[PDB]
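Hey forum,

I'm writing up a methods section and want to include a predicted complex as supplementary material. The small molecule is adenosine. I've pasted the protein sequence and the SMILES. Can someone with a working setup run it? I'll credit the forum in the acknowledgements.
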Amino acid sequence: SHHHHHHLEVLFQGPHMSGVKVRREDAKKVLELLKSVGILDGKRKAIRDEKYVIFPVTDTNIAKSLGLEVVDVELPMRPERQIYKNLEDLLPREIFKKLGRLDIVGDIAIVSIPDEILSEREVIVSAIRKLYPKVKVIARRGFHSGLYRIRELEVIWGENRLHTIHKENGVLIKVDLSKVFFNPRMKGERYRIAQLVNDGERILVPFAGVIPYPLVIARFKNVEVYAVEINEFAVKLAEENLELNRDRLKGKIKIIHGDVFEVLPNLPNFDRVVSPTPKGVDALSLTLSKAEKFLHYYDFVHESEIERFRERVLEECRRQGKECRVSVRKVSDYKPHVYKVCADVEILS
Ligand SMILES: Nc1ncnc2c1ncn2[C@@H]1O[C@H](CO)[C@@H](O)[C@H]1O
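Reply by user p_vandermeer:
Happy to help. Structure tokens for the complex are below, copy them as they are.
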């Protein structure tokens, strides 16, 4: 006596060799459809030409019951190994070129996605998820808003949170991107100055945020750092960060919750001042006034204004009766024709 047909029908060992041929304009719809009905073959790649897309299917009868055109095609197997090293490898150039720079903060990936390629959201996420399998949050970014310069962010994939712990230069940085400002790309800078700093210095860091700069400096050198931040949530996270990194800091950090322009005139002077100035803000005079040996003044300057920028720094140096050497460095490419720069000011004796 024999087997039931509805038991036999699943015994075939061969691979699926067919697919469905659809117009490109239908391709997303159909993909969804195939996934929903449950006949989408994950083992094979989809291919396309200039007019049509072909999706691999696991049941051609059901495919025909969906009114789709069944074709016999040898489709590429899915890759098992992964050799992509950057996002451009995982996206068409027309999509990738409109994307902003991708940033990783802890287990959060942040990318800017213009409205015109927003329909392609799902491939973008996919690519990101493929490049960074460890991240658990993908958020679309806008601009910085308000006095605290908090980045506009919308979670578009993963856990519905914008808080995490970021590892940098040997320190741990608790961050909440919905409540505080933070830029990971300053890593280099923060390390650099940390290496320049000598033991015994008194250092001032205005606009300190969740104190990544004081944390790195104090991580590598036995110094005292004053940090000034006006955002109380950032202050809170800064305290938690100070407590989190306490047993790995050589230096000391004093956190001051307040307005830089109010606090600094009531502070004593320092050996070194490090000013991660908010974009558009001019704190040159005030930060220089608190520096006795070195100022590191960050700013955003247009390509054709660098010279003028340097000149103005020198002017301020003369204005405060200081004799200085001024060096201007391009820290990063901020947007076209616009650089994030740093004025290294050596105050001479
Ligand atoms: N007058 C200010 N005083 C102290 N911190 C400030 C001031 N303006 C901006 N910030 C902080 O500087 C950081 C970088 O812009 C942010 O955390 C922001 O809240």
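Some notes you might quote in the supplement: Residues 161-349 form one domain. Residues 147-149, 181, 207, 209, 228-231, 234, 259-261, 278 surround adenosine (CB under 6 Å).
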